[PDB]
């Protein structure tokens with residue numbers, strides 16, 4: 001019923017000072033589509049997100065792939081861990097994103113949810129309609 | 130509800146001889162996650178697919194992005210244009226992919242369906258639940 005129950009894994013994240021390639025390596029190594037950029041001082045606070053989609057455009061535009069990742073990162077769209085799952089689903093539909101970052105009431109990184117999680121379960125699909 | 134009815138765009142494709150960067154440019158230009166690689170002799174026949182996920186690994190492994198795209202591509206997982214939409218959704222789930230290449234009875238490239246198409250419409254979501 002709620003967001004936290006659909007989380008499969010610990011959050012895949014790097015510090016905000018990470019390079020574009022460093023994010024690319026971390027995404028390939030974990031077989032995920034998005035990486036959360038955490039703050040320097042506080043590794044629990046998500047400051048941005050970087051997707052393979054962002055890296056793809058960096059490749060097409062011929063950016064320095066060893067340059068900083070923050071300039072291609074976006075400000076996180078979030079859902080609470082205590083929120084119902086359909087909120088995460090409609091934010092994805094609304095923002096045309098395939099990920100939502102799950103945080104707690106303190107604003108700390110709990111995990112990341114994917115469109116993959118919501119669509120491939122019959123129990124969820126009937127709720128989201 | 131059948132795959133051909135959820136098609137809203139002509140297939141984004143390149144010839145199988147395309148480089149990795151040439152695919153990356155095509156993906157960015159069309160704002161899509163996948164590109165279908167078509168045959169040399171017959172551009173209607175899909176021979177492979179390349180996702181931005183594949184390009185991402187190319188970046189991480191420091192491959193020559195001006196090298197050919199075919200070695201980083203995959204054998205196309207297809208669905209018929211006449212097939213019902215739940216079959217396409219079933220293949221995405223089973224094979225852990227977010228795209229399916231829609232072809233016709235002759236095996237020619239009609240279009241490409243995405244997990245984005247199936248999940249962001251209430252009419253479809255309900256039918257995916259009904260089975």
Ligand SMILES: Nc1ncnc2c1ncn2[C@@H]1O[C@H](COP(=O)(O)O)[C@@H](O)[C@H]1O
Nearest residue numbers: 009010011012032033034035112114116
């Ligand atoms: N940044 C992340 N941290 C932790 N788990 C993730 C992250 N991104 C995606 N996932 C999970 O890993 C699976 C595959 O990720 P994706 O290929 O990005 O959909 C999904 O079902 C998500 O639940």
Ligand SMILES: Nc1ncnc2c1ncn2[C@@H]1O[C@H](COP(=O)(O)O)[C@@H](O)[C@H]1O
Nearest residue numbers: 051053074075076077097098099100101
């Ligand atoms: N939870 C999120 N918060 C902010 N931006 C996002 C989020 N998920 C995806 N994006 C952005 O949407 C684009 C592609 O996202 P995705 O569909 O997750 O690959 C990239 O430019 C991402 O930075």
Ligand SMILES: Nc1ncnc2c1ncn2[C@@H]1O[C@H](COP(=O)(O)O)[C@@H](O)[C@H]1O
Nearest residue numbers: 138139140141161162163164241243245
């Ligand atoms: N290779 C392709 N050729 C034509 N249309 C596509 C292709 N890939 C995706 N689409 C469609 O265009 C949209 C692009 O989204 P996506 O590729 O999932 O980022 C999807 O909703 C599909 O309906």
Ligand SMILES: Nc1ncnc2c1ncn2[C@@H]1O[C@H](COP(=O)(O)O)[C@@H](O)[C@H]1O
Nearest residue numbers: 180182203204205206226227228229230
């Ligand atoms: N229709 C398809 N047939 C074969 N492989 C695919 C298909 N769609 C995606 N893939 C592969 O699955 C991985 C993730 O693709 P995606 O998550 O759909 O961007 C990539 O390595 C793709 O090459």
Ligand SMILES: [Cs+]
Nearest residue numbers: 071072073074
């Ligand atoms: Cs940006």
Ligand SMILES: [Cs+]
Nearest residue numbers: 084086087090
């Ligand atoms: Cs609601």
Ligand SMILES: [Cs+]
Nearest residue numbers: 093094095096
């Ligand atoms: Cs929208």
Ligand SMILES: [Cs+]
Nearest residue numbers: 095096097098
């Ligand atoms: Cs977006």
Ligand SMILES: [Cs+]
Nearest residue numbers: 133134136137
């Ligand atoms: Cs149509």
Ligand SMILES: [Cs+]
Nearest residue numbers: 200201202203
């Ligand atoms: Cs491959």
